[PDB]
Amino acid sequence: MTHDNKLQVEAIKRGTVIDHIPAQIGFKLLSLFKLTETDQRITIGLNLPSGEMGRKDLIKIENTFLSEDQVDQLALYAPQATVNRIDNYEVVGKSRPSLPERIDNVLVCPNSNCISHAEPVSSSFAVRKRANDIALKCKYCEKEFSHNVVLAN
Amino acid sequence: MTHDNKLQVEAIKRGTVIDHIPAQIGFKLLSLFKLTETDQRITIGLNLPSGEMGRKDLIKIENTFLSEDQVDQLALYAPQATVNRIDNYEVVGKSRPSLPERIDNVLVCPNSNCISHAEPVSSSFAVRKRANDIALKCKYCEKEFSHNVVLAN
Amino acid sequence: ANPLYQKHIISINDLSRDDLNLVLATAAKLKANPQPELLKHKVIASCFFEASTRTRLSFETSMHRLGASVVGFSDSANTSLGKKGETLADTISVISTYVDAIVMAHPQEGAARLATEFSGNVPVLNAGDGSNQHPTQTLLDLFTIQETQGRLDNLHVAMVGDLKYGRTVHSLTQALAKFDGNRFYFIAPDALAMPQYILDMLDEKGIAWSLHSSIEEVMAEVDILYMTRVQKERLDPSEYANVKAQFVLRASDLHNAKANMKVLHPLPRVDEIATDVDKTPHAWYFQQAGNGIFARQALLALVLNRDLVL
Amino acid sequence: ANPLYQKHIISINDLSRDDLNLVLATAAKLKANPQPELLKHKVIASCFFEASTRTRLSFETSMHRLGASVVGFSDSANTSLGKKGETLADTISVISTYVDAIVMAHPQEGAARLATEFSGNVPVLNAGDGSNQHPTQTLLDLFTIQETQGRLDNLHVAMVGDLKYGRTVHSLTQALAKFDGNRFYFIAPDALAMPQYILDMLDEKGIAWSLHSSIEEVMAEVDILYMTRVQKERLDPSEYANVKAQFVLRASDLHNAKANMKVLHPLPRVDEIATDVDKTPHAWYFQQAGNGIFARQALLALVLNRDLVL
Amino acid sequence: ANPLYQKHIISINDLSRDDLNLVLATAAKLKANPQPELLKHKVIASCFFEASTRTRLSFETSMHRLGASVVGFSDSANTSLGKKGETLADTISVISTYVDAIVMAHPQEGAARLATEFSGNVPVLNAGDGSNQHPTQTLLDLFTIQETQGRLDNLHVAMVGDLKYGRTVHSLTQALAKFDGNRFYFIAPDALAMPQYILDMLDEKGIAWSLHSSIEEVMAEVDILYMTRVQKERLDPSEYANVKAQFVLRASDLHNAKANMKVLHPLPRVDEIATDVDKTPHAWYFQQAGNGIFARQALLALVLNRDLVL
Amino acid sequence: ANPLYQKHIISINDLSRDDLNLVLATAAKLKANPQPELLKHKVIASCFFEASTRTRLSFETSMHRLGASVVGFSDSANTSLGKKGETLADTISVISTYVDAIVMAHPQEGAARLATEFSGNVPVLNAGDGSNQHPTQTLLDLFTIQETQGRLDNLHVAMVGDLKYGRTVHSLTQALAKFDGNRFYFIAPDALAMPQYILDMLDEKGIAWSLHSSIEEVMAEVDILYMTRVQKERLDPSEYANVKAQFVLRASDLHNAKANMKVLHPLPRVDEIATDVDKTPHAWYFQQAGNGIFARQALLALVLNRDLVL
């Protein structure tokens, strides 16, 4: 770990340090994944300068480790974020976000007639990477849309 | 406050620092008042022990200076929160959230028939201190409501 | 020029004791020597989003009695201005670039207020917004009161009926607390009792008021008996039957009413005031309605007219 | 006297380049010094067989702004002129012997045309006939265009939205091909693409036009951006979702728009134009609506008035 | 001859402690060992003049699970009965000549009973007569409690929601009021208070009841939490939101409850119970719902079979 | 344990080549040797939130021809469920406690499946969920073909009509797309074209398909002519008449067809098939309709009987 905190962002003992989150996205992450709802000491750096990305974001979530899965879901938002396993002052394993078969709860359905919109039903979408984009198909209407569309609204 | 634990720098150049924010409230301030919209380095501290309380949220928005207005908006969520102006790495001014007299667009009218809802208008409530709690009267339906309800809306 | 000139009449809380008085002096003048072409060439929009024939017909007569032209709709049935996402703001925006002033009744609170945020320079006028304001009725009441009692001060006003849900009765109260020395008697079913905020307001004014259970109690002390209908629907057909008998005004009840006592009712009455009352000199509802006219062009004139020449 | 005097304004195809121009000069004059009693004593019939409040309210305001009297109906609900075999012809026949001119919107094509075959000497005016003509909107568009751009020639016009089913957009096109040097950019869902007859027409005119897939493409070359709503109903809620995102105008899209570029929309907008756009100087819908007025009395004046004195 | 033979179940106040037990007792056996051919060759008219799909389906399934045939209707569109003025007395007299039992829901109070006057030897069952009664529902309520708690005597029953206009709770209190040592907690907003008569009826038979401000106060001593739904209409939509939040069950509120504690709700629920309460083992309104099938079966079994060889 | 035991049939894309055969195979036996007491003592809830009388009656007859009882509804007038806001999730949770199988048609996509999440151990059958799925229909479509043509493999299938918005054909293509060497002919107007995804799906699994301008082009090579109905609304009423006539089957067009050639139509038909085509031996939509009873029977038989001793 280079950890050049001459002034910017901490470093901890145990935990997970989601890094190289691109621009504004980080907030989205915390929001979508509710990484703020824990007793734990999260510590966020926003718009943290990095000439290699211009400005990036960092979420350090002390004494907390994300599963291969919890990591996977970040593929749509921060595809190139290196999740880090930290349990004794230094890196014990980095992680590259890999596209996952499904994306539950976080998304919404582009098709308004989807019964999903009114009932206590957590969204669920199968992911299919088809050239120049990613297709997402609702567990419900079974209607397939471009992730660009699923993300816009 | 500023992170200067066992031995670690983490001080801002210039800007505002909101400290003493009750725990689990920082994020609200963050989203609610969209303190995220900026392009400046923002550093957040989630659940940070202080003498005044063994947990607290701390936000430092570099090179941003909260208008006495913004400062007063924090009154319904983090009154004990203090807002310190940094400049040249040192506190050039402390100030606390005084209860405003009007809260804009961050609250929602409980009255389900209120014209406000469906329409392109930004919320606004005449804030007034009374007996048991703060009463918030909607500008549109002119309905007074206990802020207990309004926040829980 | 005039205080109320170019203003938006939305809520009576906005309207000062003086404003009411001003309206009230004008109304009295237009009742005296009516000026038929004061609004000549003005075009007013009568946008009755929620129909209110009694009121629509009234305001429009007013518009015509000052020589003004009228365009508008009634009931949001014809009003194809109900697409999927057709916002009231977008409607008001366009209407503004057609008319001189807009008179509107909407089935929701503050729609008239919102209306003004999109009306540009065009004054908007609330002919009712949900369970909130209805300024115009209040002004029509006050005039009838002043015209009958001779004042708007020290009156012993008796409000009867649906105190809890009654739009008008709330505003009437608001207005009279703006004056000095009025005493209120609130007679109503506990199921339909006056809101505590109103009462709470009245205490800060140092206003003496009282809750009663039957008109008889205050038959004698009253000068103005305001009646309202008991909306049965917000009651059990049975409890409304025990409650009914209790709050209807028969003329036999009038034998105590002092000479000047007048019984008002925004109308329509149905079960609440019997035909017997109709014939007694104490009966004033219908008169009250006719005065809806002068209080209405008084407002219209001041609003759309700089100088108040009469 | 005047060319358009006593004429029936039904279809814009009937209306020559000059006619439009004439209307257009008058409208500009009545906008300058309005003449309030030009139609004094005329009685116009506002027969809104298919209600169109936006339009009904507009035309009627117009009628009133020139001091004309109005009688008519809206929505064929009240209109008991819906017996078993109550023919529109029989209705028009009778109405003619009451009024001076008839303004009408019908839910079927050519009903306004038929109307004239039974109107006798009374000029009829189409406020819309089904999926066909709506002359008045077109004239209101052209004026707003001319008034903003300074001309009706050589413009790079951008039509956006429901090109296939959009009544207005078809007529607008028709009108501008009557002028010289206009370039059209047609941006629309293939599911809702401009009819080939229109395009076929435009080629005979030697008119250059182009099909685009996203506003961005022509953001910069445009002077006039005409927008229309995508009637979802004629689409699958899903395809309309892929299609939606594609054709809505946000103000961020405006950063390229040259200074003079104006975004028009017959209104109502809903999903297609965001509130952001509302505040930018490039935004013109609401203005466009206000001008519905002058283009409208301009027409009315010429039609029902021999000499064009202004 | 069993007690409930050929009798019409019209009111809860008609059945004795003994009859309530016998009905809850038979249901226990049916839920255990079924009798699918018991009512074979029977035809129960299922008449719902008040559309109550939920109540109906249960009754009708109960019917088919006993081998009986069904004919009937719902609402009064699927019904061509009593249009211009045919009487209910007439309808019954006609229908009670072909069927074996009549199950009817009517919007007016006392319908059920009036039907017993014209049905001759045919048993009438009341699915509901407006604000009056609905025994079949109470019966199942009692069977769900007896079954969960193991006793109908000595209970702590909390009744939350709209106590004044809730026909179901008024019934539950009277049934429970026939068994020793029940104590009651009424948790309702000022405007939806358990009507006095009932309150009087409890006091008179030495039965403990108390008023609380929040369900929180009693979670501990509670065995059964019968919650009802406040129809927002019975309150102004603004009044609703203030007290609303005091009366809505969430899984957090559940922490201090006895093991056996069960939450009941007649259904439908809408806001008063969080979905998170479903995963909690105290939630029992759906299991409550199913027991409706045995309570109803038991009844039908008792009213149509001279001897219940069970 | 047979494969389809206690499973919910929700999508066609859920069933394998194997499951399609097993369903078409059981139906063959039922149509031959019946099992009227197979489902005796069963209660299938038939819930049609989307009124689909045709689909319904078939399901319900299928039910009664297996000895099962039925309770249910249609539209949402005959239904008092989910008025102000009760959820479908709640309705199911209630209903899935008394019935044995739930057959439901809903106007929204994905309803069927959401119901499987709350039905617990009770099987849900999809009669239709809007533009999404409708397997039961496809099943019978497959049974009519297999039965007429003697094979589901190696066919020439022509699909005429509204290909884009037709939920039935989208399904038929995917089922047929699970069997070797099917070739497809899509004959549809520009505006009603077989949506690309499907087209992609065919291409990907090496399956031959081609676009034709008229059914005439292929009468010869055709085995099955599945025709659909173009709802004129999806086109302007004028656009409709131009291409319409290119897509309507008449007995004259039938001349060059193979012996075995059968014409299919889900129904209802309106213009696309001449009545003169009924007397022609290729017409099979009514016989198609009856096979709906076995396809549906087979299903119900498989989902409710652990072993099909047939």
Ligand SMILES: O=C(O)C[C@H](NC(=O)CP(=O)(O)O)C(=O)O
């Ligand atoms: O000069 C001051 O404002 C006091 C100063 N202390 C601080 O500013 C502490 P803080 O970083 O919490 O605002 C000191 O004396 O060191």
Ligand SMILES: [Zn+2]
């Ligand atoms: Zn969906």
Ligand SMILES: [Zn+2]
């Ligand atoms: Zn409000």
